[PDB]
Write a protein that binds this DNA or RNA. Sequence first.
DNA 1: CCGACGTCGCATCAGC
DNA 2: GCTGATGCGA
DNA 3: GTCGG
Length: 327
Amino acid sequence: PQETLNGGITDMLTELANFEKNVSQAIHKYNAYRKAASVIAKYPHKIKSGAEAKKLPGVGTKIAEKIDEFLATGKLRKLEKIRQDDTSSSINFLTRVSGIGPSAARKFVDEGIKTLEDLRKNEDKLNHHQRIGLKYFGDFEKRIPREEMLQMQDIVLNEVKKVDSEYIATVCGSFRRGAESSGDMDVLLTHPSFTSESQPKLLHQVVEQLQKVHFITDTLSKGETKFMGVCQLPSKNDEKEYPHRRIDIRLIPKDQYYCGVLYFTGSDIFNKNMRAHALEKGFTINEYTIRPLGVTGVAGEPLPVDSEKDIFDYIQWKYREPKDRSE
DNA sequence: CCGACGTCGCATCAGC
DNA sequence: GCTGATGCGA
DNA sequence: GTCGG
Ligand code: NA
Ligand code: NA
């Protein structure tokens, strides 16, 4: 379905979503508008009325009403008003800085700090994460062409193997499903020495090596199992330098790795279908394990998993390529 | 009518 | 100083 | 805000 079909409506709903999350701090209303915006974007007909839209799951009385107003007038009074509101639109905007959520954005705007300019003038009020978000504001809102992702992967797989050739690393996200572009890079790392039942050094050494070859440029957060940071392809010769990119790296015990890989490969929709399909066969799959219910409903021990396919086998489902995992 | 609605690792705050 | 809560991102 | 026990 094309944008032209219901884009005005889904744009409206997504904007309303953002104000709920960032200004009203009503996360569930945020998810409500987003789900409605999704089911509408997938709807293969130009919507003619709110009543028509209400047939869709996630679309209730109040959104039907708003769709009516939008159809008859080409706008929404409430949205027009909040757009023009100096406080609210500023709060909503500041949250586009990574590390600035609804609560921090609220406080800044309370003390008069409203713009990137104002943030720039008030560095000492920013935490480390927020400074990095501000520094790379523009870069972080850019997408990553698959070709750059491949080049990023080259470096990541290369430097990981160089640290220890027994590491296993997998770049997941939409990239692994074959997307033409990506929002960031999500890397899953395991090692034969790290299981559930078993150093608190394995992640640090990989981060270190990627910083040594100047791939990783900044650190948002870093513990023993999760790294969140910034990276950058080297500039080719004398050419225009690449944007800085968001990269996450997480260390998962070997026995939970492929549950990890499956889960962080997605898509979101596929994971739920699969996870329902799922319960029906009598098994329980979170991001870590698969476990059998359980005649009353008592989940038993985590089953052995040694590939993605192993999981599919358990629930009598035929292995499916990442490319065929949009749902 | 009224509660559910991803969850969890890390950084930092709030309180002791 | 430590422990638990809160904010944040994904 | 929407769904449903
Ligand atoms: Na509906
Ligand atoms: Na933000």
